[PDB]
Design a protein that fits this description.
Chain B: It is an enzyme of class 3 (hydrolase). This is part of a larger assembly, with chains A and B. Chain A is built from 13 helices and 20 strands. By secondary structure, chain A is an alpha/beta fold. Chain A starts with 7 loop residues before the first strand and ends in a 21-residue tail after the last helix. Chain B is elongated, with a radius of gyration of 39 Å. The chains are: A alpha/beta, B alpha/beta. At the A-B interface, helix 8, helix 10 and helix 13 of A face helix 6, helix 27 and strand 24 of B.
Amino acid sequence: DDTNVYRVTIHKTFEGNLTTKPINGAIFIFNPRTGQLFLKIIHTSVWAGQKRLGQLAKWKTAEEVAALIRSLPVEEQPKQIIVTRKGMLDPLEVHLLDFPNIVIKGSELQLPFQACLKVEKFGDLILKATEPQMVLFNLYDDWLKTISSYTAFSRLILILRALHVNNDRAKVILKPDKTTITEPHHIWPTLTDEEWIKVEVQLKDLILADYGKKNNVNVASLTQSEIRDIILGMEWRVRAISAANLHLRTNHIYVSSDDIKETGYTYILPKNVLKKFICISDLRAQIAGYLYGVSPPDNPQVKEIRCIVMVPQWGTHQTVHLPGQLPQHEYLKEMEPLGWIHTQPNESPQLSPQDVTTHAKIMADNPSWDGEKTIIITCSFTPGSCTLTAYKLTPSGYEWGRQNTDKGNNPKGYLPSHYERVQMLLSDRFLGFFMVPAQSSWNYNFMGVRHDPNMKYELQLANPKEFYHEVHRPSHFLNFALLQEGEVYSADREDLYA
Amino acid sequence: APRQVLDLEDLVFTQGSHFMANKRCQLPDGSFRRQRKGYEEVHVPALKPKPFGSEEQLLPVEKLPKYAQAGFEGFKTLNRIQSKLYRAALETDENLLLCAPTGAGKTNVALMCMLREIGKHINMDGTINVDDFKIIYIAPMRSLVQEMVGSFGKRLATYGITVAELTGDHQLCKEEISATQIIVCTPEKWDIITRKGGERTYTQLVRLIILDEIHLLHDDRGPVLEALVARAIRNIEMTQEDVRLIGLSATLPNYEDVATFLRVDPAKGLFYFDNSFRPVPLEQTYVGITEKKAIKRFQIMNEIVYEKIMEHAGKNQVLVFVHSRKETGKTARAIRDMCLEKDTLGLFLREGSASTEVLRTEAEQCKNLELKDLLPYGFAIHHAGMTRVDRTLVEDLFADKHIQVLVSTATLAWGVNLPAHTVIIKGTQVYSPEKGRWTELGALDILQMLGRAGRPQYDTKGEGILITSHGELQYYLSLLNQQLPIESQMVSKLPDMLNAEIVLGNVQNAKDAVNWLGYAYLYIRMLRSPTLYGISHDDLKGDPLLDQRRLDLVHTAALMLDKNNLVKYDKKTGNFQVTELGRIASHYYITNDTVQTYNQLLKPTLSEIELFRVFSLSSEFKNITVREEEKLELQKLLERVPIPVKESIEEPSAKINVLLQAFISQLKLEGFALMADMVYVTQSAGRLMRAIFEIVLNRGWAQLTDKTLNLCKMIDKRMWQSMCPLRQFRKLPEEVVKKIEKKNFPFERLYDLNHNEIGELIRMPKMGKTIHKYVHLFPKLELSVHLQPITRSTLKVELTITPDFQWDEKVHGSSEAFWILVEDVDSEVILHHEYFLLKAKYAQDEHLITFFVPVFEPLPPQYFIRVVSDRWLSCETQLPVSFRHLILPEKYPPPTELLDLQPLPVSALRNSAFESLYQDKFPFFNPIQTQVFNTVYNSDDNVFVGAPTGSGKTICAEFAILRMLLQSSEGRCVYITPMEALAEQVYMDWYEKFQDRLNKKVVLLTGETSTDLKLLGKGNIIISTPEKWDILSRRWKQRKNVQNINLFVVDEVHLIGGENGPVLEVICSRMRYISSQIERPIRIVALSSSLSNAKDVAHWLGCSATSTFNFHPNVRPVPLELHIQGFNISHTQTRLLSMAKPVYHAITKHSPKKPVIVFVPSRKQTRLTAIDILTTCAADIQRQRFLHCTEKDLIPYLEKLSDSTLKETLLNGVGYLHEGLSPMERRLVEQLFSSGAIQVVVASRSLCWGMNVAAHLVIIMDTQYYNGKIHAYVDYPIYDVLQMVGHANRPLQDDEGRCVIMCQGSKKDFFKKFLYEPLPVESHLDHCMHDHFNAEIVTKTIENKQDAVDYLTWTFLYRRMTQNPNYYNLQGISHRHLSDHLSELVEQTLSDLEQSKCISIEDEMDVAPLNLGMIAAYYYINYTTIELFSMSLNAKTKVRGLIEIISNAAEYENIPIRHHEDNLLRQLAQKVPHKLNNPKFNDPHVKTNLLLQAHLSRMQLSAELQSDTEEILSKAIRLIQACVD
């Protein structure tokens, strides 16, 4: 519910204008069986300098769910993100590729999730919110003992509707006694079984009676359908779907800036190749590519990656296994290899042991590339964006990745001293191109029967296609079991055109 | 008063073909009405025919025109209607209108009007060869049109005349229809052909229109017929060329008004008839169902049909009309169940047990169709649904009267001519996806279904039982009698009419819009009864001439298409402006609101999921819906698609998308509803995707164009490119395609295998042979390419493409169409595009196309050139353009500043005798002139002067010439122009400038070497040509008249870039060489246009930084505004055809008060263009506007006229300037155009060099030219066309100039790249060195290898080398790279020269001349010619062999052979004395051989070849003497 993220107030001026003061907003998220509410409240200090206000609160909500998905235990990473507000679905589906297997959808079925701020606790705490922070509370806190998650959802929804309608008869119902208190550690009044059932009657009759006295309706002659509807609301293909937005991520870059070793090389790349490469990659399908570049005249501390080489391979979640036979190419005949690079679904600030291992095992399988002068560029898919970094293995990481046979997640012999940084720069002055395999294209993603790192294949001075290209998925595209002579049936082929 | 818009929704007809416009009906003769339960049944008996009048005899084929009777065999007795019509049908080109019952025989009336139109072109010694005649025959239906074409082919082949049917794509089959006679087609066929332009390339020779069954005007299809009629009438009144208009329709009212709209005379051109002359008089019955529930109606229909079945179960024929797909077999078994449950009643359709061939009907048991259970009984079901030959096997025994009950669909009435006794038609409706659901069937459809009851041979009078509604039976009985009035649906497609005619250009302004909207059949309709057309009588009388109605109606279409970007103009102008998107939509027949949606949805990031969804949301099918009854199976339909539409939900968008994908996969969707939706959607899908593709490709989204080419191929072939390639060639089975598809074996490695290995992938040598032949039929284009750097950001790419698969003329057919697209570094957007259309002639040969592509700041590692066919599946060839080592040329310093000094008067130079021929001409010298004056007069330095043609370069040379004359009286000066026409023209100025005024004799170089040596030495001023001034004076050492030249001038010094400029370049080099050697200071004055490399030109030709002055073409005496005007078709024919409107329009728009020179590519194009401009100005009633004078003022100059074309063209004020007219005729035309009587001049492209008459407006139209050397088009020369653009300026009057470069899409881009920017000068010394090197080696100035190096140290390549070494492909610009380049170049040159037997190379350093070398040096012939002569001329040869040897010379192939000339010289060499062995007339060797044979035979030739033979003989003499030596 991003209904509360946008808030203002109106007051009369000495000019005669209704002067607008922005107020604390909050984007709310609910989970029924967890009884869980998480409201990310930003104080009015947010919209001081931003011209746009409504779409701004919307984008803030989408980015907020994005960073919350980045911070929340992956064990709780949900499959779907349902949105009361339609405009969330767009920026959410833009930013939540950071949970790319989390689909975004809007609800035609609306919930009184914002008007549940008609409780003094949450509303007051929202207006008293002194800084930006997401807080959580337990709504059905007491129910789950001898009640169901489903019934807790239905009851919270109905009572929320009744509170959004009047909240005065709702306070009458919710404090009908002076001795019956509510648990303060809980959200709702802890009532007995028959007490909660009677409160269900109160809230349901409230919804029905207010509905009828509003709509001049014979609300007793309404069915259970109208009653239920009114009370509770209004009366790899995943990759083929998500990966098509790879062009929107390109225009959002982050280049890891940190302490400068200030002795080694610094890698400067033109960003158009990185855009096109994240476009020929996907959100989870990681692409691998060997970089090629030049050092500028009289500028030995700079290594500008001015060309991309894509060799026959495929990419998985955490690793990428590329051709052991490396690229020979005339277009890079005056060039040098500066190492490797991979797109990444997962975001952490540590150079992959598997990647650095392939790198050291390539610098030891070919001494032409210099180990300390080899670097691996990881392009991580952050909330609706790409963040790029380039790290390099010293002799320590080199030994680790060279003799390291088991490429597990945290193997025997990983270390925080293993990898080292180099500084990278995006540049808008010079552009290169890419070179890809000859007899097939780079991508064998859907084809594992034709995969080998020793594979014999040339490189070609040409551009690539997207990951899901009609070529590099030969499986489904040739899937055709057809009865031909059906075309004689229904022989009305009226054309009249050409 | 401004026009007032009307709400264009309601004033038109809803649900066409069912209108029932009349408010009452009329009873027939014996109509009887019986009111029964559940249905009211009305019956009307057969008619009594109109009695033949007294003294009336029918017509056989004997007393008819003799040439007409051919092909009418077997037909001795015609129908009386055709008999009475044939007199005027054979004797009159009047517009004819027929209204007669279906089956009356008007078909043969139109057939006879076509046979007589064929006889209109005939010969004594030649047959009906149709190079003079063509026709357009618009028949209503596809099956009937196909049937008529198939029959009239054989019937009409009697003379050998071919009737073709119109299905062919635009450019694939166009020259085949050009190889066709009368074209049979549909209204939409003709409409799409006209919006594509297909009608005007055939027009002026297609003098007949044959419209059959025009009654669909009342149906919604009426818009196409009305567009045809309106455009026909309007264009005919503009062209004044006649055309026969023959329409045939059923018997109904409004035929007089339709004839009026057709411009048909009711006096002698009317043929009207009722239902009384019918072939078999029809007794009709309408069973109207008033039942409230269709649940009752549906079985009531079965019961009433059972009654109508047991009625004619006697000796009779029932033809059952069923409306649904499987309804053919579904109406079956209902009669069977009635007959079976009737207790052995209803059956027994024969005369006994043994009779009527029941054993035959049983023994015909096996058919792939449902004949199994239907043939043993007499009632059967027939359709194209079941099979192909089973329809034939049903119709055979039907004609044998062995099937007295046959259930079929309206495709039967659309099918071949087969008769029937009685009809029983159930339903009266169809399922139309154009409006979205069930609709009353077509009027023409019901007339068709009632057109097959009753035979001419066995059946006497026919009947019919139609089960329809009691409410719609009023319309249905007023249809079966002459009571339905034929109205129009014009206002519906009036928007598409406006868009199409505005793209077509016959209607630009609101005036032409009203003139066109008055051309509709709707115009006569509103004129005679606006009643149902949208006006009350008071305002109707208040606007009687429909002026106000044409002011209102047009406005609505104009504004709607204006908002939807098919038009753009405010209420201010009224003149229309169609753009690329409107063009794509109008040409590819997608809706204009769908085109708006497509323009708004089209984005660079369009994925497949979004592209197919945008195609499904097209406004073409706003009537398609997603019913639940099929939405259950719709789940599966979404499940079987590989590309997910999942953003789309269960509704018409996703249903259309998943129908697209299910069809593409060839997936079976159970429901007939979804089936029909698929039919219509995928029928218009090709068109929609084609429009979107053209749009996004022209917009430049390369990724969108790739997605759209994938979609286009997949929608053409109804398949996926991920499937085996040979699935597009019908030859190899699905089993074989799947056998190749089972395992992982890319196509791209299927070629390198052997014939056995190609099948050994699946282990089947049985296929290896045919699979191999298929792989050799698999299309491939092969690409080589070169890159040449001209400018820093601007480069050129020259590609050669050869077909790498031998074509199959049954599959490849006429030609191969593809796109070659130049793309940037990462290939996201396209840089440029050339659409390749290669005919059957040019397969397997390299295709050499030259186009320019730029670069930008971030120098890229590689660009792309992608050549992929239009229709092919999985066939493409990309070509890298590697720029990693690319270094473009130096950015040239900017131009010299235009400083302001006083306009120098002509008395500035203190000489009055020099001011005399200057002052009286121009009062003030140009800024460039007054700036140059100081350095050009008061100094003795060498000048390089850049100013574009028209800034006074002649004065820049003349000041220095007068300066040399002032320096000394007897000083010498030689000016050189490599353009012979320019040299002669400037000599024409200098003759009066010098000989009379200054007395300094002027001499212009000539071919005769002795005569030219003598010419010099008498005159102090010598104008010259490049070859005449180089060949002579290359050895000038002894001729003392050369070294004394104190002044040398050179006109058009930028010309180095083109071929044959090496002569003048070596000449200026040697000029400076002699200037150093003679010990005298020798001045040079070079005048050329603006060039970036002017600095290097000056530094080489002996000028310093301040003493150089180069100005850009933007500093001009009268500044010129130039524009690029595109016609987006690739065919040069289509471009030249559709460019005529812009030329006349530009005459009227930019310079209606100024003269217009229209430059066209060809000489004969000049007469034709004058004719076209005259036919465009004559319709514009203000005609004869290109003359400013009276009638009789021309007669004294027209008395000497030779071509009747030129006389009349000048009479209308146009006039043409070309070779074929006499020189005095050129003088007369030049006088007229320069004096202002003829406001227009049509000039051939070659005349832009020798144009001695100035002008105000220039229109350089169709900048291509069809060079026969490659037998293909090529760009006009850059500097030539630049001078052509300079040729439109009148310094005396005009303050600015107007130049219109009409060029194609790809050929206007090079204009934008080369015209507004100046052009540098290039050096081809690397290519043309050996000739002059040999001449000088003989002349003993080049004495060794190092001496040839010294020679290299002087030329133009020496300059441009480190300036742009990418031009001569020099891998280096440093000292050692330049040294090695010069060294190796001179080395290889002298080596080839010594191998040619021309020189002797001793010690590898020294070199000297020999016999052949001296021969060449003396005779001024090319080394190749000398080598061929030395190697061919032998002991026993004769005149014949030496003729061919000298004809194949180098300097003998420069003459070209023009278009379609391989026949003239062929028939000439048929009787030429010395025959040849396997020669092609496209080789200038055999061409010069033919010229030699003709000149030796003294037979007069046509001027086009006479000029050529003259040019040959004028040069052959030196070669002759050298060969004798």
